[PDB]
Amino acid sequence: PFRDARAAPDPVLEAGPVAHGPLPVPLVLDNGSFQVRAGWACPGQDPGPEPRLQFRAVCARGRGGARGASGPQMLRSPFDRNVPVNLELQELLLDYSFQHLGVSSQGCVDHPIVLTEAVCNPLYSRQMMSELLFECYGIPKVAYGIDSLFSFYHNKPKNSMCSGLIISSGYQCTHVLPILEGRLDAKNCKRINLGGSQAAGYLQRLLQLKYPGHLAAITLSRMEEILHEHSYIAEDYVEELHKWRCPDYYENNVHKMQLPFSVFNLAAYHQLFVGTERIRAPEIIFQPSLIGEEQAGIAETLQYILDRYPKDIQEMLVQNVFLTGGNTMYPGMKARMEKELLEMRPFRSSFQVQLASNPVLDAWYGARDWALNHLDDNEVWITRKEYEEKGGEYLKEHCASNIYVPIRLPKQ
Amino acid sequence: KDPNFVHSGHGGAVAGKKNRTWKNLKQILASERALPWQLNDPNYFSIDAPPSFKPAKKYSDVSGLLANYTDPQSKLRFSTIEEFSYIRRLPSDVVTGYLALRKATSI
Amino acid sequence: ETEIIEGEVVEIQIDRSKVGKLTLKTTEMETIYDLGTKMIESLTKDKVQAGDVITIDKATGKISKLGRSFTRARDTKFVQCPDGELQKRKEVVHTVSLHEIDVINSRTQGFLALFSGDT
Amino acid sequence: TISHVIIGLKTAKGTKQLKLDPSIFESLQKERVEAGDVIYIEANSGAVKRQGRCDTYATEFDLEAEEYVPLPKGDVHKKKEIIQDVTLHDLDVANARPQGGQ
Amino acid sequence: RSRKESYSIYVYKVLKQVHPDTGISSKAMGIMNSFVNDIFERIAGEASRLAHYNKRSTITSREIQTAVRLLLPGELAKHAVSEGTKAVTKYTS
Amino acid sequence: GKARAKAKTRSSRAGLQFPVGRVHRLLRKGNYSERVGAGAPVYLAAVLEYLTAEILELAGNAARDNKKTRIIPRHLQLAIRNDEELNKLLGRVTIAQGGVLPNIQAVLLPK
Amino acid sequence: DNIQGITKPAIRRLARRGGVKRISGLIYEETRGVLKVFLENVIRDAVTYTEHAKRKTVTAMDVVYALKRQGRTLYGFGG
Ligand SMILES: Nc1ncnc2c1ncn2[C@@H]1O[C@H](COP(=O)(O)OP(=O)(O)O)[C@@H](O)[C@H]1O
């Protein structure tokens, strides 16, 4: 049987929250093309006390100006392939988050934020982000970062120089990130344009084409639900689909989906037999050829990036391979990744593949931990005054962040 | 009740007749390409995966199994006899939907 | 085990490496095929026209035509179109004499002396 | 012109590289072995046996004269200790008349 | 002087794609000119009339495609539709 | 102002041969509608390409069997009238100096 | 099967309007062919016009436009 979601959250509090400790209490605003994760830093305790505002990153204003439905409740999104591009909707989403976040005493900002950004950002869009952040809120200082790198920082034993590969899988894109001694090398770094949203759309299209009768009975919500629970990645795709060819055992492990009920009354309210689509959806990232778009795929991308390195430095970076993101939640992803890595590694070589404790939420935990240990570091954050002396597209070049190139954006 | 009441536009379409929200992502990248990027300078262009040199397998469009045949009448692929009967029994709507799913020479 | 492609050919098209395309047809299915360079020669050596029931060994490339179908007879063994799937995984049993094995290993082409008695 | 040829072997247990003298390269060229075939090599004897193209290229063409085999599930490098027996009469017969070399 | 204009140097240029060693007489050139501009006028007028019927201002790819569907009798219609769709798809990309 | 020297034509970008620019000009000047779309001339050129290719292929095939190396109106006439689709597309047209297809009714044939 | 809905007396009536005295008995089966073919062209256009307007209902003006393109004009139906 299907299940549904909820709504009407109560994320409120007093004017604001300060616990006994230090003067500054920064904010964590982990972004996301799918959903936004927020919550106060809460210094003084390593475990996350109470993350708040776990809502889909979808907003919609009233057609006639009645009200702005921005939180959980057509629809619009501020993101355009993992990079935000909407201005007004981004402002209203931020206003919703701040209003539920406890604006202290009047118009202004509370404390520095540790908002995260895509792996690579065009040097026009971070300018708009900074402008609509400062000139609309006036934060004293803001620091950027990457959610996957923050997750690895949280999962790393301690803050030190580390190297390896980071496998990120999100809503609109996936990334293979080579980090070297705690410094990301954004030169031979690659991404795959396909993500979980495209997989869900593919599964939707397949199920609509399989049952032309009730096309509107199933929607994006049910597709996401089944892709989130009734699916897994295969150790070897061709051999698995060959094994699921015999009829006696094909039905032994098939899943029944009971749609709304009141032919034996099982045509409109069918059972929606799925025994192959539960594997064709997860393997989209591994095999982009399943869609008309042609690309290398996760198996060949990291090969293309790994064969341009000398044998000496390959050993320790392969020794630390990490799986992060949203799509890295299907069971058996670790086995598939380690087998694919074993196929391409030397005969006697060694490797280690690690999966995060919470692949979707460790990004926020890592951002919180990084912000907790860098409040006093005045060389990392971007001061409010610096936005006028600096062109517009300035970065700190700190760890867990992008790379800065010397350039100025002409504009007037 | 709000952080600021003097919010100013950042290049909207209030005056002109352009997109109200912002410039398109394609336009954004086209404008960003005009920057004098250095030869070794990173950007948003040299971050996409290269095209695969490995031939791509063929899979049944109705059952997701290893295909070994085709069909000149519809230009699809199946695996067994019942798959052939089913695909012949299907109308043109599902056929063109399957063709457009994995995009082909047919729109 | 062997892979066998048996069926009636409908149309052959070879361009001017070379690109080839042909459509096989049994009584229960049809299938188009793109030919590699080797198959181009394997089909040009043994002139194959429309309405010919042919059997092909996939692992080798041998064309063994059985006859022509009645459909194209209008305008030399007349065989009907085959039945079942075009591609069959056939299990083949084979027995060989022990003296046969001994004779094969004697010369460069030891099987020749097994008929003429030259061994 | 030619001194040695570097070849790369790969199975579903690892990958290795080998250096071949021109004799072994000639043996490979005689077997009509190109890039993407499953090869068997014995270092002691210099034997070269092509076991067919790998299955991953099976989709390269719809009809190809070649036969395709799966990627081997085993070690690229195999070591064994073998003990060989040979009688004198074998040596006499082998060296008595010009060995066929065919 | 005068740009009398014509497709003479176009249909002839098409000829080499089908028969690389065939010539055209002047009268045949005039015949092909008349044929091509006649078909042009027919298709353009049909698309116009259809757009006016649907109270529209612009004659687009789909309107002229429907005009071709109306005017071309049989398999020529669907084959020309495929040819035009391929041409426009290659033009856009 | 600087512009590209010897810019590529729209016909070459479309992969066709008939002039897309001339077709667009004719559409705009023919007063078929006040505004003319972008892809319409490309589609029309493609259709004209298909028709010309078909008729010329048939005309050349007809002329080859007459042991002649040049297309004349007679070959075009033989090409059109021998194909049912082109015959019904060109039912009400007269080809100058093209003659008539040779056919004799069974009744009028001796014996 | 509905072409047989064009009964024999209906064909007789249609013939009688034309001004013919005697009707062969095998005429009907061929005449039903002509009704079968002449009607297979206007619908070809009538649906197609309908399919241009993104709508799936055959209005009374589409048939008029089809008959006009074919060369048979009729009055009284919004022509
Ligand atoms: N528990 C889960 N099981 C399966 N897929 C998930 C799960 N959680 C998230 N996803 C997938 O991950 C995607 C969201 O990725 P996300 O973490 O938002 O990346 P980012 O934060 O970079 O946008 C969604 O498309 C969703 O399909």
Tab-separated table of all heavy atoms in Angstrom, chain A residues 30-35 37 79 82 147 169-173 195-197 200 224 227-229 325-330 359-360, ligand 1:
chain	number	residue	atom	x	y	z
A	30	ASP	N	22.131	25.133	4.728
A	30	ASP	CA	22.411	24.153	3.684
A	30	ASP	C	21.331	24.190	2.607
A	30	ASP	O	20.177	23.829	2.863
A	30	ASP	CB	22.520	22.749	4.284
A	30	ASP	CG	23.026	21.719	3.289
A	30	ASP	OD1	23.288	22.083	2.123
A	30	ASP	OD2	23.164	20.542	3.677
A	31	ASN	N	21.696	24.615	1.400
A	31	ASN	CA	20.742	24.719	0.308
A	31	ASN	C	20.531	23.355	-0.348
A	31	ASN	O	21.057	22.329	0.095
A	31	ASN	CB	21.216	25.752	-0.712
A	31	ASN	CG	20.073	26.536	-1.321
A	31	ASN	OD1	18.911	26.150	-1.206
A	31	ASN	ND2	20.399	27.644	-1.978
A	32	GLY	N	19.751	23.347	-1.425
A	32	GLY	CA	19.507	22.129	-2.172
A	32	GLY	C	18.433	22.277	-3.229
A	32	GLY	O	17.382	22.873	-2.978
A	33	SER	N	18.691	21.735	-4.423
A	33	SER	CA	17.716	21.794	-5.505
A	33	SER	C	16.455	20.999	-5.192
A	33	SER	O	15.394	21.298	-5.750
A	33	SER	CB	18.341	21.288	-6.804
A	33	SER	OG	17.397	21.288	-7.862
A	34	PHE	N	16.546	20.000	-4.314
A	34	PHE	CA	15.393	19.197	-3.922
A	34	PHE	C	14.735	19.749	-2.662
A	34	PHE	O	13.544	20.075	-2.666
A	34	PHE	CB	15.818	17.741	-3.712
A	34	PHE	CG	14.713	16.848	-3.220
A	34	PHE	CD1	13.577	16.644	-3.985
A	34	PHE	CD2	14.813	16.210	-1.996
A	34	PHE	CE1	12.562	15.820	-3.537
A	34	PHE	CE2	13.803	15.387	-1.541
A	34	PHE	CZ	12.674	15.193	-2.313
A	35	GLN	N	15.502	19.865	-1.581
A	35	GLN	CA	14.995	20.400	-0.328
A	35	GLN	C	16.089	21.210	0.350
A	35	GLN	O	17.276	21.071	0.045
A	35	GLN	CB	14.497	19.283	0.600
A	35	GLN	CG	15.585	18.345	1.089
A	35	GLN	CD	15.045	17.252	1.987
A	35	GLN	OE1	15.724	16.792	2.904
A	35	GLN	NE2	13.817	16.824	1.724
A	37	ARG	N	17.798	22.381	4.017
A	37	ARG	CA	17.992	21.994	5.407
A	37	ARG	C	18.580	23.172	6.170
A	37	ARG	O	19.601	23.734	5.760
A	37	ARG	CB	18.915	20.779	5.514
A	37	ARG	CG	18.239	19.448	5.230
A	37	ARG	CD	18.206	19.148	3.738
A	37	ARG	NE	19.546	18.987	3.184
A	37	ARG	CZ	19.818	18.920	1.888
A	37	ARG	NH1	18.862	18.982	0.976
A	37	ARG	NH2	21.082	18.783	1.497
A	79	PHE	N	15.825	26.708	-8.514
A	79	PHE	CA	17.044	26.111	-9.035
A	79	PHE	C	16.924	25.834	-10.527
A	79	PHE	O	15.830	25.627	-11.059
A	79	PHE	CB	17.373	24.820	-8.286
A	79	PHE	CG	17.966	25.047	-6.925
A	79	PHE	CD1	17.154	25.339	-5.842
A	79	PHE	CD2	19.335	24.974	-6.730
A	79	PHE	CE1	17.697	25.552	-4.589
A	79	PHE	CE2	19.883	25.184	-5.479
A	79	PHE	CZ	19.063	25.473	-4.408
A	82	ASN	N	20.975	22.533	-10.390
A	82	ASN	CA	21.812	22.605	-9.193
A	82	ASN	C	22.372	23.996	-8.917
A	82	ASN	O	23.089	24.167	-7.925
A	82	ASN	CB	22.979	21.607	-9.237
A	82	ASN	CG	23.375	21.114	-7.859
A	82	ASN	OD1	22.722	21.427	-6.864
A	82	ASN	ND2	24.450	20.338	-7.794
A	147	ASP	N	28.290	21.109	-0.206
A	147	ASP	CA	27.635	20.190	0.721
A	147	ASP	C	28.378	18.862	0.824
A	147	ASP	O	28.535	18.315	1.922
A	147	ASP	CB	26.182	19.972	0.294
A	147	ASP	CG	26.056	19.391	-1.105
A	147	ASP	OD1	27.092	19.210	-1.780
A	147	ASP	OD2	24.916	19.115	-1.532
A	169	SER	N	25.771	12.478	-5.512
A	169	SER	CA	24.607	12.258	-6.363
A	169	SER	C	23.419	13.001	-5.774
A	169	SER	O	22.968	12.676	-4.673
A	169	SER	CB	24.297	10.765	-6.494
A	169	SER	OG	23.975	10.209	-5.233
A	170	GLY	N	22.910	13.988	-6.508
A	170	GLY	CA	21.848	14.825	-5.990
A	170	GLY	C	20.583	14.827	-6.822
A	170	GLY	O	20.192	13.799	-7.382
A	171	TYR	N	19.931	15.989	-6.906
A	171	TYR	CA	18.654	16.091	-7.604
A	171	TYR	C	18.833	16.264	-9.107
A	171	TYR	O	18.144	15.607	-9.894
A	171	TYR	CB	17.841	17.248	-7.021
A	171	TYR	CG	16.412	17.329	-7.516
A	171	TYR	CD1	15.413	16.550	-6.948
A	171	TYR	CD2	16.060	18.205	-8.533
A	171	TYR	CE1	14.107	16.628	-7.393
A	171	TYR	CE2	14.756	18.292	-8.983
A	171	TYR	CZ	13.784	17.501	-8.408
A	171	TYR	OH	12.484	17.583	-8.854
A	172	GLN	N	19.750	17.138	-9.528
A	172	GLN	CA	19.906	17.465	-10.936
A	172	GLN	C	21.251	17.072	-11.530
A	172	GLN	O	21.386	17.094	-12.758
A	172	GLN	CB	19.693	18.971	-11.164
A	172	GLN	CG	18.260	19.436	-10.977
A	172	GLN	CD	17.342	18.950	-12.080
A	172	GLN	OE1	17.376	19.459	-13.201
A	172	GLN	NE2	16.516	17.958	-11.769
A	173	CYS	N	22.233	16.695	-10.715
A	173	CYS	CA	23.567	16.399	-11.220
A	173	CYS	C	24.285	15.482	-10.243
A	173	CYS	O	23.912	15.373	-9.072
A	173	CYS	CB	24.392	17.675	-11.435
A	173	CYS	SG	23.983	18.651	-12.900
A	195	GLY	N	20.425	12.922	-12.847
A	195	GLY	CA	20.245	12.803	-11.413
A	195	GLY	C	18.974	12.086	-11.005
A	195	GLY	O	18.294	11.485	-11.842
A	196	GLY	N	18.650	12.142	-9.711
A	196	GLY	CA	17.496	11.416	-9.206
A	196	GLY	C	16.180	11.886	-9.791
A	196	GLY	O	15.263	11.083	-9.986
A	197	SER	N	16.057	13.188	-10.061
A	197	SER	CA	14.825	13.707	-10.646
A	197	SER	C	14.578	13.108	-12.025
A	197	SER	O	13.445	12.744	-12.361
A	197	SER	CB	14.882	15.231	-10.728
A	197	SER	OG	13.791	15.741	-11.474
A	200	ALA	N	13.360	9.586	-11.581
A	200	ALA	CA	11.952	9.549	-11.200
A	200	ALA	C	11.053	9.839	-12.394
A	200	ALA	O	10.014	9.192	-12.570
A	200	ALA	CB	11.686	10.544	-10.071
A	224	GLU	N	8.297	9.154	-6.548
A	224	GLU	CA	9.379	9.382	-5.597
A	224	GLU	C	9.321	8.385	-4.448
A	224	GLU	O	10.356	7.869	-4.015
A	224	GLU	CB	9.329	10.817	-5.067
A	224	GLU	CG	9.541	11.889	-6.126
A	224	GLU	CD	10.999	12.061	-6.510
A	224	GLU	OE1	11.860	11.366	-5.930
A	224	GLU	OE2	11.285	12.891	-7.398
A	227	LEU	N	10.484	4.958	-5.765
A	227	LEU	CA	11.912	5.036	-6.054
A	227	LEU	C	12.733	5.130	-4.775
A	227	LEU	O	13.903	4.732	-4.758
A	227	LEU	CB	12.195	6.232	-6.966
A	227	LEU	CG	13.617	6.411	-7.504
A	227	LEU	CD1	13.583	6.774	-8.980
A	227	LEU	CD2	14.366	7.471	-6.713
A	228	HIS	N	12.137	5.646	-3.700
A	228	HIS	CA	12.820	5.802	-2.424
A	228	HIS	C	12.770	4.548	-1.567
A	228	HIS	O	13.664	4.343	-0.738
A	228	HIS	CB	12.204	6.963	-1.638
A	228	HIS	CG	12.703	8.311	-2.055
A	228	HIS	ND1	12.457	8.843	-3.302
A	228	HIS	CD2	13.425	9.240	-1.385
A	228	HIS	CE1	13.012	10.040	-3.385
A	228	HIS	NE2	13.605	10.304	-2.235
A	229	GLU	N	11.761	3.700	-1.743
A	229	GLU	CA	11.677	2.503	-0.914
A	229	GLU	C	11.720	1.208	-1.707
A	229	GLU	O	12.420	0.274	-1.305
A	229	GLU	CB	10.392	2.538	-0.065
A	229	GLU	CG	10.494	1.805	1.275
A	229	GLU	CD	10.548	0.295	1.131
A	229	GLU	OE1	9.942	-0.236	0.179
A	229	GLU	OE2	11.200	-0.360	1.970
A	325	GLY	N	25.545	12.103	-1.045
A	325	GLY	CA	24.462	12.627	-1.845
A	325	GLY	C	23.139	11.947	-1.554
A	325	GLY	O	22.963	11.251	-0.550
A	326	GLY	N	22.188	12.158	-2.462
A	326	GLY	CA	20.854	11.619	-2.292
A	326	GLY	C	20.641	10.278	-2.963
A	326	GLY	O	20.098	9.355	-2.348
A	327	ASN	N	21.057	10.156	-4.226
A	327	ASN	CA	20.880	8.898	-4.944
A	327	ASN	C	21.716	7.768	-4.356
A	327	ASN	O	21.431	6.599	-4.635
A	327	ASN	CB	21.216	9.076	-6.424
A	327	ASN	CG	20.110	9.767	-7.194
A	327	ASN	OD1	20.303	10.853	-7.738
A	327	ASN	ND2	18.942	9.137	-7.243
A	328	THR	N	22.734	8.081	-3.555
A	328	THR	CA	23.515	7.037	-2.904
A	328	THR	C	22.799	6.538	-1.656
A	328	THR	O	23.385	6.494	-0.570
A	328	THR	CB	24.915	7.540	-2.544
A	328	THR	OG1	24.812	8.637	-1.626
A	328	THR	CG2	25.669	7.981	-3.788
A	329	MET	N	21.529	6.161	-1.805
A	329	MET	CA	20.741	5.629	-0.707
A	329	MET	C	20.164	4.252	-0.991
A	329	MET	O	19.702	3.592	-0.052
A	329	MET	CB	19.594	6.590	-0.355
A	329	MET	CG	19.965	7.657	0.661
A	329	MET	SD	20.348	6.970	2.284
A	329	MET	CE	18.734	7.011	3.059
A	330	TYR	N	20.167	3.805	-2.243
A	330	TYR	CA	19.699	2.462	-2.552
A	330	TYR	C	20.627	1.429	-1.917
A	330	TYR	O	21.850	1.599	-1.935
A	330	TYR	CB	19.631	2.244	-4.062
A	330	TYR	CG	19.088	3.421	-4.842
A	330	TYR	CD1	19.881	4.094	-5.761
A	330	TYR	CD2	17.779	3.849	-4.669
A	330	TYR	CE1	19.387	5.167	-6.481
A	330	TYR	CE2	17.277	4.922	-5.383
A	330	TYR	CZ	18.086	5.576	-6.287
A	330	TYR	OH	17.593	6.644	-7.001
A	359	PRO	N	23.612	9.915	4.319
A	359	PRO	CA	24.130	10.538	3.089
A	359	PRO	C	23.424	11.822	2.682
A	359	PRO	O	23.994	12.597	1.904
A	359	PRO	CB	23.939	9.442	2.031
A	359	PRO	CG	23.809	8.169	2.804
A	359	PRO	CD	23.140	8.539	4.090
A	360	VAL	N	22.212	12.080	3.173
A	360	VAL	CA	21.479	13.276	2.772
A	360	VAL	C	21.591	14.369	3.831
A	360	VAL	O	21.480	15.560	3.518
A	360	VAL	CB	20.004	12.937	2.476
A	360	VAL	CG1	19.280	12.508	3.745
A	360	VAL	CG2	19.298	14.113	1.813
H	1	LIG	N1	16.230	8.138	1.057
H	1	LIG	C1	16.385	8.271	-0.282
H	1	LIG	N2	16.317	7.200	-1.104
H	1	LIG	C2	16.468	7.318	-2.435
H	1	LIG	N3	16.694	8.488	-3.059
H	1	LIG	C3	16.785	9.643	-2.359
H	1	LIG	C4	16.632	9.596	-0.897
H	1	LIG	N4	16.763	10.860	-0.455
H	1	LIG	C5	16.982	11.648	-1.538
H	1	LIG	N5	16.996	10.923	-2.672
H	1	LIG	C6	17.209	11.457	-4.039
H	1	LIG	O1	18.201	12.486	-3.997
H	1	LIG	C7	17.786	13.640	-4.728
H	1	LIG	C8	17.996	14.883	-3.875
H	1	LIG	O2	19.388	15.160	-3.738
H	1	LIG	P1	19.890	16.322	-2.741
H	1	LIG	O3	20.378	15.676	-1.467
H	1	LIG	O4	18.824	17.389	-2.686
H	1	LIG	O5	21.156	16.935	-3.522
H	1	LIG	P2	21.482	18.509	-3.432
H	1	LIG	O6	21.371	18.817	-1.958
H	1	LIG	O7	22.880	18.625	-3.989
H	1	LIG	O8	20.418	19.154	-4.288
H	1	LIG	C9	16.316	13.456	-5.070
H	1	LIG	O9	16.134	13.497	-6.487
H	1	LIG	C10	15.925	12.091	-4.543
H	1	LIG	O10	15.368	11.301	-5.597
